[PDB]
Design a protein around this ligand. Structure first.
Ligand code: HEM
Lengths: 396, 10
């Protein structure tokens, strides 16, 4: 029988994972009324993530989804921007896109990353120092990656708040025409930005993406919009909630917080354990089969939705001992917070860099930081990205 | 959202 996964799962997924993962390495479940296959064990997850039988095909997903809702033309630029990126395609097309996007990074762009992150972190902490209590998400965890990614991409400072707010609104849309409307505005904005960098190339990643070439091959206008969008959003709320979840873990384990403050040689290991323990993404993006596939000994039929639970794999006792415990001194190497295989997260070094600097700088500036509320007052967002509604902290 | 469906997640 197909276990129904609802709002309780969304808010608190790891106890569901602990019960299904013991039963089999893959579970047949129903998520949002859609039957699908949930890969749970670490080995099975690595195999699924390297299995060419799992396809990124948003068009087939749409067609299959229409069938489960029993319902059955020109795509708007928003519609296209949402799905015409790296995570929306398979090789060879995926190989080409990611070859070109990797060329766009210049050495100057990469080197400015660390100085820029420490300057933004600095500015943000100067703006909250003196307040007794702040919501660390709105005051720090969300603005930092918004700024860093926006500056790397080339979004002007005066436009950054608005792009962030549109991203939040895209994230909470419930109806396709609404989502498409938000996306259409975003795509229109990114079309203007791209036009201005064609006319006057700067030292930003948009200009790098326009100029990248493989002989005469280049990113089309469509691919540019979709990739600039994905690069802006893929690390915005994901980095913020990594920082949020990690700071929450650190505050709920004050001995390790103090240990980390006293010994920065534990910082790298602390960021790794944050990704393993409570990653902002416990699920990867939806995949669809075209033919039967074999994952963890479980046969999955053709025309099936397949989702890989990075979180369940990261909490797999076959791979990590005492996996429900947060322990920065652990060997957390080999987690799947950034994926695995051809779609492995392109931004993983940047996400690690921002998180390491942000947490380090927080504990340096605010030695007496603590939760400002009782844990029973915290709430998780009703969202596939694992994140808190707020993180109230007393800076002291 | 980034496989073309409302409900966040891209
Ligand atoms: C803590 C923050 C982040 C987490 C947890 C994360 C996680 C992931 C995961 C798990 C995937 C694989 C998706 C799948 O297989 O369905 C992925 C892909 C990707 N991520 Fe990240 N990511 C983060 C930050 C970033 C940042 C900062 C960027 C860029 C600014 C970025 C850009 C990308 C891109 C372009 C892909 C697609 C690569 C491909 O499909 O070949 N991510 N991410």
């Amino acid at each position: 029988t197909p276990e129904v996964l609802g709002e309780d799962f969304i808010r608190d997924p790891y106890p569901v994972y602990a019960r299904l993962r013991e039963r089999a390495p893959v579970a047949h479940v129903v998520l949002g009324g859609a039957p699908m296959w949930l890969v749970l064990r670490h080995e099975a997850a690595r195999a699924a993530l390297t299995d060419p039988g799992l396809h990124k095909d948003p068009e087939r997903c749409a067609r299959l989804a229409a069938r489960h809702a029993g319902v059955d033309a020109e795509k708007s630029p928003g519609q296209r921007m949402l799905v015409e990126h790296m995570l929306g395609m398979d090789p060879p097309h995926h190989t080409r896109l990611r070859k070109l996007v990797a060329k766009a990074f210049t050495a100057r762009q990469i080197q400015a990353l660390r100085p820029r992150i420490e300057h933004t972190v600095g500015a943000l902490l100067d703006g909250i120092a003196g307040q007794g209590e702040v919501d660390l998400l709105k005051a720090f965890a969300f603005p930092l990656p918004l700024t860093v990614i926006s500056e790397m991409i080339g979004v002007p400072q005066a436009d950054q708040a608005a792009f962030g707010a549109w991203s939040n609104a895209l994230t909470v849309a419930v109806q396709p025409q609404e989502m498409h409307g938000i996306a259409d505005r975003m795509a229109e904005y990114l079309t203007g930005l791209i036009a201005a960098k064609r006319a006057a190339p700067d030292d930003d990643l948009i200009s790098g993406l326009i100029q990248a070439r493989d002989h005469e091959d280049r990113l089309s206008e469509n691919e540019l919009v979709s990739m600039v969008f994905q690069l802006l959003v893929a690390g915005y709320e994901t980095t913020a909630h990594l920082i949020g979840n990690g700071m929450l873990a650190l505050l709920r384990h004050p001995d390790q917080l103090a240990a980390l403050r006293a010994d920065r040689s534990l910082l790298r290991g602390a960021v790794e354990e944050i990704s393993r323990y409570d990653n902002s993404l416990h699920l990867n993006t939806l995949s669809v089969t075209s033919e039967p596939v074999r994952i963890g000994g479980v046969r999955i039929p053709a025309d099936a939705f397949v989702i890989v639970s990075l979180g369940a794999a990261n909490h797999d006792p076959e791979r990590f001992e005492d996996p429900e415990r947060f322990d920065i001194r652990r060997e957390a190497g080999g987690h799947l917070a950034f994926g695995h295989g051809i779609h492995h997260c392109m931004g993983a070094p940047l996400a690690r860099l921002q998180t390491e600097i942000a947490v380090g700088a927080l504990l340096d500036r605010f030695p007496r930081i603590e939760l400002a509320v009782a844990p029973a007052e915290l709430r998780r967002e009703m969202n596939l990205t694992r994140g808190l509604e707020s993180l109230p902290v007393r800076l002291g | 959202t980034x496989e073309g469906f409302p409900x966040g997640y891209x």
